[PDB]
A paper describes a structure:
In humans, this protein family contains two paralogs, the ubiquitously expressed DMT1, which is involved in the uptake and distribution of Fe2+ and Mn2+, and NRAMP1, which participates in the resistance against infections and nutrient recycling. We show that both proteins catalyze selective metal ion transport coupled to the symport of H+, but additionally also mediate uncoupled H+ flux. Their structures, while sharing general properties with known prokaryotic homologs, display distinct features that lead to stronger transition metal ion selectivity.
As in case of NRAMP1 the low yield of the protein in detergent solution has complicated sybody selection, we have attempted structure determination of this paralog without fiducial markers by combining 57’783 micrographs from five datasets. These data have allowed us to identify two distinct conformations of the transporter in the same sample. The correspondence of equivalent structures of the two human SLC11 paralogs to an occluded state is illustrated by the inaccessibility of the region harboring the conserved ion binding site from either side of the membrane. With respect to their conformations, the two human paralogs presumably display intermediates on the transport cycle, which in case of the occluded structures of DMT1 and NRAMP1 would be placed between outward-open and inward-occluded conformations found in the prokaryotic transporter DraNRAMP, where the intracellular gate precluding access to the metal binding site has closed while the extracellular gate has not yet opened.
Author numbering: 54 to 522
Write the structure that this text describes.
């Protein structure tokens, strides 16, 4: 019925908001800038795998009555839960750095260069603890508020895409054909980055926590099956919305960015009066390395400054939404792995601090290209940390002790094993690419130790899963 779906509605907008974090925005920015339409099939495969993973998360959370954090606390011994919890902590703080840089760039774009970066970060942390102050008369649930916000930003991106008017002929091969002849290693780097960024590792915990919101009676199996199917339908709808918005941004950015040289863009939109044109043109015909600031200024110079202001508004909305979803996710990590049970205080304090330090340092002593590189490294780190969040769920839905009936079938088991070996191989190849890239020989030992710890934790989790397999 429509009323039952309306009652079950509310989470899907939340995971979609998490999917539309500013880190995803920068990642698809760079992907469209460099490879263009050749990586859309990567986006499709990553999105469908994320949908499968969140289906598993919703299934586990609804059926067991507790989030995945509680079950890993119940199962694993002390040291593995501690290490894994620090893993989600690192992933979530990386996401926080992503969204704070996004908000800072958006505020820079609103100010038209008048307000510097430190002003942006201070005002966004002020707004964050203003949201904390909102507890004065807090009776809110955020679902309608942030559905309105996501619809707003979706309408902005859709209007930008439609006024761009792309042609779907190339989109056919981009979406359908799973290959990329003629591209190179940076294309692989951005593909891995988009794969990691589209599937936020913390979203598994986030959904496994929000499942409790609806009243589920675990005694009756038909009711929990209906709840699971409703949650799957809602997740499918949310993922479809996320993918269509990503399709819009992919098409427009690939059409407006591919084989575009710096001096050509400068000549095209030098008749206008942005006054930000200085950075774009180093008087050479080469690929235009573009961040959110440069992307917005280029869109405004090609189509009109309205494009820029609305783009920055969408970026600010995405940053606020991602900040909120990170706060909720991290609170649930606290209650799952330590049962610390705070109310939005300690998590937000630690996250905003661990974000403000590096970004304030990079704003004081580095330029915006360093910010773009830092976000690249952040979303690469998110990709590297993804298996540490996709394997525990695989294990915990593997064994039948929690789910005698609602276990994993043979087809799901083998498919999930295939994806887990695929992602582990991807991480191995990426770290192999990273090994010869160290400028200083002193980092060899640190990189080797970090890789050894990563492989050891991965092999321990694989041993646990094969025991559960």
């Amino acid at each position: 019925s429509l009323r039952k779906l309306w009652a079950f509605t509310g989470p899907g907008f939340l995971m979609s908001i998490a999917f539309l974090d500013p880190g995803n925005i920068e990642s698809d920015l760079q992907a469209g800038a460099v490879a263009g339409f050749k990586l859309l099939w990567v986006l499709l495969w990553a999105t469908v795998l994320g949908l499968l993973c969140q289906r598993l998360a919703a299934r586990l959370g609804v059926v067991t009555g507790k989030d995945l954090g509680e079950v890993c606390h119940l199962y694993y011994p002390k040291v593995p839960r501690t290490v894994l919890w620090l893993t989600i902590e690192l992933a979530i703080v990386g996401s926080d750095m992503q969204e704070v840089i996004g908000t800072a760039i958006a505020f820079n774009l609103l100010s038209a260069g008048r307000i510097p970066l430190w002003g942006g970060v201070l005002i966004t942390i002020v707004d964050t603890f203003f949201f904390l102050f909102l507890d004065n008369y807090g009776l809110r649930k955020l679902e309608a508020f942030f559905g309105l916000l996501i619809t707003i930003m979706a309408l902005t991106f859709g209007y930008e895409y439609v006024v761009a008017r792309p042609e779907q002929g190339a989109l056919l091969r981009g979406l359908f054909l799973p290959s990329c002849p003629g591209c190179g290693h940076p294309e692989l780097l951005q593909a891995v980055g988009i794969v990691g960024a589209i599937i936020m590792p913390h979203n598994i915990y986030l959904h496994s926590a929000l499942v409790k919101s609806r009243e589920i009676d675990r005694a009756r199996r038909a009711d929990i099956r209906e709840a699971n199917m409703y949650f799957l339908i809602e997740a499918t709808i949310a993922l479809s919305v996320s993918f269509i918005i990503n399709l819009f941004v992919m098409a427009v950015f690939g059409q407006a960015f591919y084989q575009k040289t710096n001096q050509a863009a400068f000549n095209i939109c030098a008749n206008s009066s942005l006054h930000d044109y200085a950075k774009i043109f180093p008087m050479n015909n080469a690929t235009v390395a573009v961040d959110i600031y440069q992307g917005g200024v280029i869109l405004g110079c090609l189509f009109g400054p309205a494009a820029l202001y609305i783009w920055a508004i969408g970026l600010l909305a995405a940053g606020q939404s991602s900040t909120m979803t990170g706060t909720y996710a991290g609170q649930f990590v606290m209650e799952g792995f330590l049962r610390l049970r705070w109310s939005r205080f300690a998590r937000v304090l630690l996250t905003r601090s661990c974000a403000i330090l590096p970004t304030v340092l990079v704003a004081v002593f580095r330029d915006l290209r360093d910010l773009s590189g830092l976000n690249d490294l952040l979303n690469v780190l998110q990709s590297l940390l993804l298996p540490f969040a996709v394997l525990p769920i695989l294990t915990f839905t593997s064994m039948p002790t929690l789910m005698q009936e609602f276990a994993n079938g043979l087809l799901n088991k083998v498919v999930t094993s295939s994806i887990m070996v695929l992602v582990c191989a991807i991480n191995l190849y990426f770290v192999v690419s990273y090994l010869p890239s160290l400028p200083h020989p002193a980092y060899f030992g640190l990189a080797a130790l970090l890789a050894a710890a990563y492989l050891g934790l991965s092999t321990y989790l694989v041993w646990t899963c094969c025991l559960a397999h």
